[PDB]
Design a protein around this nucleic acid. Structure first.
Ligand code: ZN
Lengths: 99, 948
DNA sequence: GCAGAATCGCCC
């Protein structure tokens, strides 16, 4: 297998195994571990390939990578969690039945 | 009437002279095959840059005078490539890597191929072919040649007549042309040194034209192939056997239990290709709009020379996936190895039992001649192991794919520079800077001596190493990959050729597009007004659904009143693609000349296999050699092929009679012009050949509906019906819910995937702070109910990316439900379309040029501010809109053969769409792989080379 | 590890 096939199989495992949180930060920390600095210039066509059956997430990943690149930390999964999980610090939800 | 009869009397070719002070040398270099140190190169024939506007590609060439008072005329088209041979050092190279001519020369010899052998004379001096009063140092010289007389150019048998010069405008350059005539126009003869010859031109033709035609026939004696092609053109030898004594066979052929029959069939198939391919290439062709370079739309915004050259590099980058696929695919047309027989203990039916094989490992083996004597001794592979290792693909296999030509190899390397590298997941590799400053700078490199480490072909090979195919020695029946221009009428919507003629399926699709235009949606799916909030989003979908469902009611009520049996017609429908047989329809690249010609020769051989097998079964070889059998049998087999190969389901061609209306024509006096005088004479004329075979199309087919009857295959096609959790996120709305996410939920932190997956599992939805709960609960219930109705009914395995694709999916699901076709998924074709992206240069060392690199630190510094153009392919859900843009295509084909129905004993053919082999071809193909999804590579031409 | 098919033109 190519290196990009292994990154793709590892992201589909993260996304298909979460419940009761959004998945975006764990996907970003996985890409930052796998690629480091090369994330700063990751294209939409490459992001869409790596997300596999979840390629709709690509707009949200590329924005989060732009907030890391425009705020100056080194590219490691520790520094990225300290920034992302720190910069947040909200939604009111209605129940909809089924007929 | 026909294009042959309408064409005018003229010469056999022209020498063009372009002025160096004004000619756009950098533009032609981007369309050329120049290598560093070249003496000759090829360029495309194009109106406004290599020939004048209104150049006539079809002519009646004057080629013989039996006596001074009679001329004979041959109808012919021009050859597609122009050969630049005088002052050629003034055109820049396409690729900067050094040492290619010695590499090609060494590799040709280990494969046992014939090098160019020069005539014992010198080349013609400039003062013997230039117009009087032109300075030979001020001009670039090039030849344009007719397809019927190009072997006479190669062998030094044409005559140039400078007194017959004509002034022509080539773009903004004041150019001159001089006519070429065959030496048979002079019945008293001309002195032998008065004939036109150039050793560099003939050598370039040997390497870049004829060696690839020889490789497509499995012939090594390239010079003997050229002599027999010349004699076929001039002496009408199409029905005489000629290639069989040049054939060679591997041990798997010689030891086969049916060896005698197999040697006859492979020989006869190569003879039929040599008789018929030149005749179809010489035919009169239509002149495409893409031939006029000064009207190409891709220049529309350009100001000045630098802007135009940059536009040509972006054009080339969009063609690169076609060329890389023919290098990386294991089943490329460039790797076809011979013919083999299903050995009784095999799956094939009788008409499929002989088939074409591929394999680079087989292409290295030793061979035997037609009398079973030892012939070529073979090659053991690289004498020193290169960076890809033992038994793997080496740079010599890329040199073999480029026909041992430094001109073709330079242009293949230039296209390969656009490709992404893909490292293996388990192999340690140096970083790009430490390879370029380290091993690539070694004084032991045979190409660059370590003095061009960033551009060297060994550095490009090292970067792309894991994308090359395996080296194969097996004998399996696989599809092979072809490249070229598409034809006018392609049927690639979801039901293909269903109700194409009689309202029709094409009219149904046009009626749907008109209803969507009245809702404010265009043919590519762009809106005139985007939705403001939850209500508009729902209303947009309900109005599109109501438009589709009204058109279904009219169409079904038509089928009722007209009594059409459409339930049966759905079961038998096919996707249909046309591969064009016009050599002038091909894209403006000299590599596409080789890919078109070799695609055509391969298809003719494959069509002939059952035709030859049946004739030899009725007329057996009895231990005669193929040459001695063909001596009695070939004239009958030519007549059988013409009847049985054409209009039987793959190849279409028309025969035409060529007539000239006047008994005389106004021409220059050639006996006066040879002595320097110009005046008109009315020469009596007649045709030398009356019959022409105009090629039309090759047809590629793919079945849509699975009937259940083959019970072995069902698990690849079966439609599930149970409620899944992924029903919203893999349903019809998810891409639209993501596009409009910020208009729908203005100030949330949640992703669209998580918001809707949370509603799927937990039945809860967030309500935006200023909005109202009713309006959001209505949005949630609209998405849910619609997503379950799609889950229960859908047989088209697509998630739609635009409102036109959404509406067409809804329409075709409603037709299939009326037919009862709701238990299986249908077959799909997807287009892989090129996309061009600018990226940081660090992993693309070719941007540094022929520069020295002293350290990995200096490489990083030198690349820090630079960028490279690279290309990747995107999958399209909608091949139909791409086919309207007249695309260049690359696809895999197998020609299957079968008996007719109802006791019709005749052999019929279908060219079925197949699969790509080799993991390096494209990342979108990576996981047979699918029975129900197939792929085609496509690049559009409308809005690039042809105006809308 | 990759259906089955008697064929041509017609084309908006
Ligand atoms: Zn080198």
């Amino acid at each position: 297998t190519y290196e990009i096939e292994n990154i793709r199989a590892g992201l589909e495992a993260i996304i298909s195994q979460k419940q009761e949180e959004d998945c975006v930060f764990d996907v970003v920390c996985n890409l930052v571990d796998a690629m480091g600095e090369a994330c700063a210039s990751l294209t939409r066509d490459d992001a869409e390939y790596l997300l596999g059956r979840f390629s709709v997430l690509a707009d949200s990943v590329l924005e989060t990578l732009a907030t890391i690149a425009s705020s100056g930390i080194e590219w490691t999964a520790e520094a990225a969690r300290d920034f992302l999980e720190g910069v947040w610090g909200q939604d009111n939800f209605i129940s909809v039945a089924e007929p | 009437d026909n294009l042959g009869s309408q064409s005018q009397p003229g010469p056999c070719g022209y020498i063009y002279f372009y002025p160096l002070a004004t000619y756009p040398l950098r533009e032609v270099a981007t369309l050329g095959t120049g290598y560093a140190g070249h003496r000759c190169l090829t360029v495309p024939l194009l109106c406004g840059i290599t020939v004048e506007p209104g150049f006539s590609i079809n002519v009646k060439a004057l080629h013989r005078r039996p006596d001074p008072n009679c001329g004979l005329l041959r109808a012919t088209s021009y050859h597609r490539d122009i050969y630049v041979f005088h002052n050629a050092h003034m055109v820049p190279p396409i690729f900067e890597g050094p040492g290619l001519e010695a590499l090609c020369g060494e590799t040709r010899e280990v494969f046992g191929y014939d090098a160019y052998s020069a005539l014992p004379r010198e080349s013609s001096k400039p003062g013997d072919f230039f117009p009087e009063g032109l300075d030979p140092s001020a001009y670039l010289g090039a030849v344009a040649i007719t397809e019927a007389f190009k072997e006479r150019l190669y062998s030094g048998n044409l005559v140039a007549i400078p007194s017959l010069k004509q002034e022509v405008a080539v773009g903004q350059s004041a150019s001159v042309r001089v006519p070429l005539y065959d030496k048979e126009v002079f019945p008293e003869g001309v002195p032998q040194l008065r004939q036109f010859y150039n050793s560099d031109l003939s050598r370039c033709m040997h390497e870049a034209l004829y060696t690839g035609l020889a490789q497509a026939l499995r012939v090594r004696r390239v010079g003997k192939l050229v002599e027999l092609l010349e004699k076929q053109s001039l002496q009408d030898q199409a029905k005489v056997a000629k290639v069989a004594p040049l054939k060679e066979f591997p041990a798997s052929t010689i030891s086969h239990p049916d060896s005698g029959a197999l040697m006859i069939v492979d020989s006869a198939a190569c003879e039929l290709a040599v008789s018929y391919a030149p005749a179809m290439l010489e035919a009169s062709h239509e002149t495409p709009a893409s031939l006029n370079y000064d009207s190409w739309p891709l220049f529309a915004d350009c100001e000045g020379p630098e802007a135009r050259v940059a536009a040509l590099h972006r054009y080339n980058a969009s063609l690169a996936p076609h060329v890389s696929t023919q290098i990386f695919a294991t089943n490329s047309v460039l790797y076809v190895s011979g013919v083999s027989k299903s050995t009784g203990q095999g799956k094939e039916s009788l008409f499929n039992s002989f088939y074409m094989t591929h394999g680079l490992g087989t292409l290295q083996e030793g061979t035997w001649d037609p009398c079973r004597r030892p012939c070529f001794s073979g090659w053991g592979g690289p004498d020193v192991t290169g960076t890809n290792g033992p038994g793997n693909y080496a740079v010599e296999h890329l040199v073999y794919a480029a026909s041992f030509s430094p001109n073709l190899l330079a242009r293949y390397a230039y296209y390969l520079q656009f490709c992404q590298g893909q490292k293996s997941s388990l192999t340690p590799v140096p970083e790009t800077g430490s390879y370029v400053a380290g091993a690539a700078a070694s004084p032991m490199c045979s190409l660059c001596e370590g003095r061009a480490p960033a551009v060297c072909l060994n550095t490009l090979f090292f970067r792309l190493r894991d994308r090359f195919p395996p080296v194969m020695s097996t004998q399996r029946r696989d599809p092979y990959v072809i490249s070229g221009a598409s034809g006018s009428y392609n049927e690639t919507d979801f039901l293909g050729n269903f109700l194409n003629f009689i309202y029709t399926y094409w009219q149904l699709n046009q009626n749907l597009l008109e209803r969507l235009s009245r809702l404010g949606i265009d043919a590519e799916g762009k809106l005139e007004k985007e939705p403001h909030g939850p209500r508009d989003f729902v209303k947009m979908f309900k109005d599109v659904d109501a438009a589709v469902d009204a058109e279904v009611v009219q169409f079904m009520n038509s089928m009722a009143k007209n009594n059409i049996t459409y339930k049966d017609l759905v079961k038998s429908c096919y996707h249909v693609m046309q591969y064009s047989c016009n050599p002038f329809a091909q894209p403006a690249c000299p590599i596409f000349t080789q890919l078109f010609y070799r695609s055509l020769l391969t298809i003719l051989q494959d069509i002939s296999l059952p035709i030859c097998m049946c004739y030899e079964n009725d007329n057996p070889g009895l231990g005669q050699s193929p040459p001695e059998w063909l001596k009695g049998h070939y004239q009958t087999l030519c007549t059988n092929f013409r009847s049985l190969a054409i209009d039987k389901g793959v190849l279409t061609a028309k025969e035409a009679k060529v007539v000239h209306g006047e008994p005389t024509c106004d021409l220059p006096d050639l006996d006066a012009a040879l002595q320097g005088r110009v005046y008109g004479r009315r020469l009596p004329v007649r045709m030398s050949k009356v019959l022409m075979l105009c090629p039309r199309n090759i047809k590629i087919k793919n079945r849509v509906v699975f009937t259940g009857e083959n019970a072995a295959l069902q698990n690849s096609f079966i439609k599930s019906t149970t409620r899944r959790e992924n029903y919203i996120i893999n349903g019809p709305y998810m891409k639209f819910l993501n596009t409009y996410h910020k208009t729908l939920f203005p100030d949330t932190k949640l992703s669209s995937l998580y918001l809707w997956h949370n509603f799927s599992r937990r039945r809860s939805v967030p309500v935006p702070s200023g909005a109202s709960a009713e309006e959001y609960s209505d949005l949630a219930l609209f998405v849910d109910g619609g997503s379950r109705a799609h889950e229960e009914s859908n047989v088209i395995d697509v998630v739609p990316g635009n409102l036109v694709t959404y509406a067409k999916q809804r329409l075709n699901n409603a037709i299939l439900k009326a037919c009862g076709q709701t238990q299986f998924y249908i077959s799909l074709i997807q287009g892989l379309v090129p996309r061009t992206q600018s990226v940081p240069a660090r992993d693309y060392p070719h941007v540094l040029g022929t520069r020295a690199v002293e350290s990995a630190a200096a490489y990083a510094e030198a690349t820090s501010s630079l960028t490279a153009t690279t290309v990747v392919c995107a999958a399209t859900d909608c091949l139909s809109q791409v086919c309207k843009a007249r695309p260049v295509v690359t696809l895999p084909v197998t020609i299957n053969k079968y008996t007719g129905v109802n006791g019709n004993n005749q052999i019929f053919q279908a060219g079925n769409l197949g699969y790509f082999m080799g993991r390096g071809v494209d990342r979108n193909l990576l996981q047979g792989s699918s029975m129900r999804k197939k792929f085609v590579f496509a690049t559009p031409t409308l809005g690039l080379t042809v105006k809308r």
